[PDB]
Design an enzyme around this catalytic site. Structure first.
Site, PDB file in Angstrom:
ATOM      1  N   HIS A  83       0.821  -1.207   0.000  1.00  0.00           N
ATOM      2  CA  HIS A  83       0.000   0.000   0.000  1.00  0.00           C
ATOM      3  C   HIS A  83       0.865   1.272   0.000  1.00  0.00           C
ATOM      4  O   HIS A  83       0.736   2.129  -0.880  1.00  0.00           O
ATOM      5  CB  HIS A  83      -0.951  -0.016   1.203  1.00  0.00           C
ATOM      6  CG  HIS A  83      -1.985  -1.101   1.153  1.00  0.00           C
ATOM      7  ND1 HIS A  83      -2.254  -1.925   2.224  1.00  0.00           N
ATOM      8  CD2 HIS A  83      -2.839  -1.481   0.168  1.00  0.00           C
ATOM      9  CE1 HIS A  83      -3.217  -2.775   1.898  1.00  0.00           C
ATOM     10  NE2 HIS A  83      -3.591  -2.524   0.655  1.00  0.00           N
ATOM     11  N   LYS A 117     -19.950  -5.904  10.164  1.00  0.00           N
ATOM     12  CA  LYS A 117     -19.013  -5.945  11.295  1.00  0.00           C
ATOM     13  C   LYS A 117     -17.971  -7.045  11.103  1.00  0.00           C
ATOM     14  O   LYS A 117     -18.167  -8.175  11.557  1.00  0.00           O
ATOM     15  CB  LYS A 117     -19.773  -6.166  12.608  1.00  0.00           C
ATOM     16  CG  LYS A 117     -18.889  -6.104  13.847  1.00  0.00           C
ATOM     17  CD  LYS A 117     -17.696  -7.029  13.687  1.00  0.00           C
ATOM     18  CE  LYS A 117     -16.448  -6.439  14.313  1.00  0.00           C
ATOM     19  NZ  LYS A 117     -15.220  -6.975  13.665  1.00  0.00           N
ATOM     20  N   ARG A 170      -0.811  -6.218  -7.345  1.00  0.00           N
ATOM     21  CA  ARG A 170       0.141  -7.133  -6.738  1.00  0.00           C
ATOM     22  C   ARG A 170      -0.185  -8.571  -7.192  1.00  0.00           C
ATOM     23  O   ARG A 170      -1.133  -8.769  -7.961  1.00  0.00           O
ATOM     24  CB  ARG A 170       0.176  -6.910  -5.219  1.00  0.00           C
ATOM     25  CG  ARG A 170      -0.596  -7.879  -4.352  1.00  0.00           C
ATOM     26  CD  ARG A 170      -2.056  -7.572  -4.056  1.00  0.00           C
ATOM     27  NE  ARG A 170      -2.664  -8.863  -3.723  1.00  0.00           N
ATOM     28  CZ  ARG A 170      -3.849  -9.086  -3.167  1.00  0.00           C
ATOM     29  NH1 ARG A 170      -4.659  -8.107  -2.802  1.00  0.00           N
ATOM     30  NH2 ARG A 170      -4.215 -10.338  -2.962  1.00  0.00           N
ATOM     31  N   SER A 200      -3.338  -7.442   2.890  1.00  0.00           N
ATOM     32  CA  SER A 200      -3.846  -7.330   4.249  1.00  0.00           C
ATOM     33  C   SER A 200      -4.360  -8.678   4.734  1.00  0.00           C
ATOM     34  O   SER A 200      -3.981  -9.171   5.793  1.00  0.00           O
ATOM     35  CB  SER A 200      -4.953  -6.284   4.296  1.00  0.00           C
ATOM     36  OG  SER A 200      -4.416  -5.019   3.963  1.00  0.00           O
TER      37      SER A 200
END
Ligand SMILES: CC(C)(COP(=O)(O)OP(=O)(O)OC[C@H]1O[C@@H](n2cnc3c(N)ncnc32)[C@H](O)[C@H]1OP(=O)(O)O)[C@H](O)C(=O)NCCC(=O)NCCS
Ligand SMILES: CC(C)(COP(=O)(O)OP(=O)(O)OC[C@H]1O[C@@H](n2cnc3c(N)ncnc32)[C@H](O)[C@H]1OP(=O)(O)O)[C@H](O)C(=O)NCCC(=O)NCCS
Ligand SMILES: CC(C)(COP(=O)(O)OP(=O)(O)OC[C@H]1O[C@@H](n2cnc3c(N)ncnc32)[C@H](O)[C@H]1OP(=O)(O)O)[C@H](O)C(=O)NCCC(=O)NCCS
Ligand SMILES: CC(C)(COP(=O)(O)OP(=O)(O)OC[C@H]1O[C@@H](n2cnc3c(N)ncnc32)[C@H](O)[C@H]1OP(=O)(O)O)[C@H](O)C(=O)NCCC(=O)NCCS
Ligand SMILES: CC(C)(COP(=O)(O)OP(=O)(O)OC[C@H]1O[C@@H](n2cnc3c(N)ncnc32)[C@H](O)[C@H]1OP(=O)(O)O)[C@H](O)C(=O)NCCC(=O)NCCS
Ligand SMILES: CC(C)(COP(=O)(O)OP(=O)(O)OC[C@H]1O[C@@H](n2cnc3c(N)ncnc32)[C@H](O)[C@H]1OP(=O)(O)O)[C@H](O)C(=O)NCCC(=O)NCCS
Lengths: 157, 157, 157, 157, 157, 157
Positions: D17, D41, D90, D127
């Site tokens: 990032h 959530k 990526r 991530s």
């Protein structure tokens, strides 16, 4: 200021190219279209015609200039005092090759390459295919600028 | 009636090709295999041999005919009074290029292109690879029709 | 006669879908659009609405009918007395998955699958993306049929 | 002035990032990193932590700001008074999906998306993967910023 | 000695898997098939059945053993005193993801991953697809080992 | 014992090649690097130089030998008394072609091909690109072995 180079052989410039020029010009202070002379004696249009054709197709973009490229793209980019290449993606782009050159170009000169997908309606035209289709009598005039259609008509007749 | 054209240079026709011919013939009223003469002097088999080989490999398909293609595929398709191309996909197909030509072909002549994956057992044969492997002594006879194996034997000896 | 099935969940049918229906109908004697009920309770439109929407978007194609699909696509295809599936390819299609299912479908039932690239102008719309963009207020009305725009307006208000 | 938005959920921001942020900041007058709250959530770090982490990882880039994104990316871009998105590529990027959204985003709001390949050494971190590898005890500290390593250590212990 | 691990969830092991096991066993002194327990409660066969099925399908390979995998694949590989993973490629493999994990796995533990394309005749079977096709009554028995067909019959009846 | 062949034209051997040699040597008892003479008169370095360069770049790998390849790769592999090829994947690899040849090679000679992704830092170098970049004055010395840099310097001066 901010700047990008749009490299290529533009033999001839198509409306996919122009679409990308237009997007580069909206997003960077200056754009330079670098026309890269075919390695050996291989073109359909000579350099002057290619320059004229790009010039004539980009009169609506005042922040763009056309120059003949020499040597490594990255060397030209650096000489323009810029550090960015903008390349268009269309159907049939060898993207893996583009990526390999992007990584090499970053490695050797710190120049970034930004990729942008061309408009769907111009995504299937390439200089190569436009020439082959036009030589065998097909109508590709909707996918080329009028300055290119004019010169393509003459050379076919 | 409904119709499709299977275009190519069939130098030589492989069993991947035949697989696709077979599928076209089951799904369309008439199929035309268009043999497209290599641009320059570049073949392994001359046109007559290519025609014979396709003919001899498709005797089980009565609704298919073999013709030499000329000019733009789409022009030939239109002349056959059809509006469909059927192309096989195998391992190593340049599918992005196929797609670019499909979109161009639709643009210039309204001709649709249907893609069909060849049977797994015939998915790694191409005319090119079959020739290169056979020239260097490898056995590709299981991936070519018998009419092709017969002619490939003779020309190698 | 010749026939093809265009399977999917059409929740909602987009103009990419219709483009493909149109091409199937021009090339096959009969086309059946098979609406395949989402596995669990997951749709935006219920079955009746999906049927109505496809029906209302295909009145110009008299050789096409709309039916609810049940079980294996290949079982439905066989029941329609056909042996061909026609699937559209767009930007974002999982083509490798489509290919895996095409080979499986041929293996278990002898059904061929033909792939056709959707028109460039409709190549970036999917049911999924059209819904997500419209829910967050974006205008996707140019990429959906009017029968769909009418029903999408109401359900959003 | 010229401007680009780098959108994402940055849960957590990786050095892939940051590499992309750095390239955006060198080539555009202002860069805005838009942190887009996970739909339901579902995060590992809450919004404040994500903001802090991006902030703390970008102190060397004075022309970049961090803001929480809301709604359509293109709506946020327009609100920042910009018309460009910059996205990193990526290993493992769903590029076809990125392309579909790029074309949709251009269609609905005239916003261009520029793609840039992340540095080879940061090209295999995501991530998602960084979290899964770290939870099962693997060392990914070389692929995350120190502000992220600090917060990832604490939350694991 | 030389060694490789073939990781997966083998729910159930297919003949594509076995093809790859066979190739690993011919090329490495020892092969370990690592069965990796599904993250949450999600399988069709429980661990014991999966082990039995792999065991029963690999009696012809004396240099291969079956073990339950725990944690990071690379940690298991290291514990087997090996430094190689062997993964099969088939139609529908997410190869970009496989590549991202290969690079991550090399980064964190120095473990190499070798990829091998499965035989064309077994290239369209996956555990997932075999289950979905069999549940809806399709015959996938030619693409699974007999120990798997036996257990799949019982559980369906 | 176990064995693999790493085939190629190594004109010149890059550090991407060496990375792959290193991984082959760690995982197989013997490795043979097969240097395959360019079909026509087309190299930059002659065979002896290519051999020397590979030899000089692999002194740290005692279980590897360098030999000139002749004919079908699979025939050479068989002659080395091996049944495995190890090929590196980098950015720009034509993987579909590699796959087609892998399936053909398995078909005609039972030889397996294992693919391994080269280290990210060496993933954008190819012999071709290294030569083109170096001829036009760019610095690729970080991506080639020192024995290659020495010989590339001399031939450029
Ligand atoms: C970057 C580069 C790929 C872009 O230039 P381009 O000629 O416009 O080529 P593109 O990638 O844009 O698109 C197609 C290209 O194939 C080129 N091409 C030329 N000869 C070709 C061949 N025999 N076959 C296949 N493609 C060929 C086309 O020229 C070129 O456009 P066109 O074919 O549609 O006329 C080209 O390699 C280049 O940059 N030359 C300057 C080189 C440089 O800096 N090299 C260091 C490399 S990292
Ligand atoms: C459509 C077309 C791609 C199909 O013909 P094809 O020759 O059978 O080629 P395919 O795409 O089917 O498959 C491989 C092809 O590479 C062709 N080819 C010829 N010279 C080649 C070269 N130097 N290198 C790479 N491939 C080459 C092969 O001939 C051809 O088959 P083969 O190589 O296995 O012998 C070909 O471009 C054509 O159609 N010519 C008629 C053209 C036309 O209508 N053009 C308008 C374009 S939209
Ligand atoms: C063939 C099949 C892929 C086509 O149906 P489709 O639902 O229209 O799906 P498509 O491949 O056309 O395109 C996107 C699809 O992702 C589907 N999808 C449903 N849930 C999804 C999930 N949670 N995430 C990702 N995609 C999902 C979409 O429904 C579907 O269309 P949409 O998402 O745009 O609303 C679907 O698998 C099917 O056929 N069901 C009948 C099954 C059958 O015969 N199976 C045997 C398999 S060989
Ligand atoms: C554009 C967008 C793709 C980028 O946001 P992103 O969350 O960072 O996701 P990325 O594409 O960058 O990379 C991976 C992503 O998969 C996302 N993701 C979230 N849930 C996931 C699921 N269940 N499975 C697979 N991927 C998932 C990840 O969040 C996200 O990053 P991460 O998984 O590594 O944590 C995302 O779709 C978005 O933009 N939301 C705002 C939406 C918008 O404008 N939509 C109109 C669409 S044109
Ligand atoms: C490496 C790994 C990809 C291989 O395991 P696998 O479960 O057999 O999965 P595969 O990649 O081989 O093939 C398909 C896989 O999708 C898996 N899968 C599980 N849930 C899925 C979901 N909801 N949707 C899509 N695929 C799913 C399948 O389990 C799995 O096989 P299957 O679906 O055909 O039953 C898996 O990620 C893993 O390794 N777990 C151990 C993890 C590890 O070491 N992680 C560090 C990552 S670098
Ligand atoms: C397997 C093979 C692909 C590997 O050899 P390679 O020459 O090193 O080529 P690679 O695939 O590794 O990588 C790029 C290759 O393109 C080769 N190449 C040669 N001429 C080329 C051309 N005019 N244009 C594009 N690529 C070319 C390169 O030589 C070669 O490496 P390089 O270009 O970087 O110098 C090559 O085809 C071969 O094996 N020859 C022995 C053949 C054999 O067994 N054939 C039966 C086929 S199944």
């Amino acid at each position: 200021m901010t700047g990008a180079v749009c490299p290529g052989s533009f033999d001839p410039v198509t409306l996919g190219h122009v679409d990308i020029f237009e997007r580069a010009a909206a997003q960077f202070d200056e754009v330079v279209v670098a026309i890269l002379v075919n390695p050996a004696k291989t073109g359909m249009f000579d350099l002057d015609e290619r320059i004229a054709m790009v010039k004539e197709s980009t009169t609506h973009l005042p922040n763009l200039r056309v120059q003949v490229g020499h040597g490594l793209v990255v060397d030209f980019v650096r000489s323009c005092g810029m550090t960015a290449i903008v390349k268009g993606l269309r159907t049939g782009t060898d993207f893996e090759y583009e990526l390999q050159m992007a990584q090499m170009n970053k490695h050797i000169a710190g120049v970034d390459t930004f990729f942008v997908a061309t408009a769907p309606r111009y995504s299937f035209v390439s200089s190569s295919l436009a020439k082959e289709v036009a030589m065998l009598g097909g109508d590709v005039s909707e996918l080329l600028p009028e300055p290119v259609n004019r010169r393509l008509r003459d050379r076919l007749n």
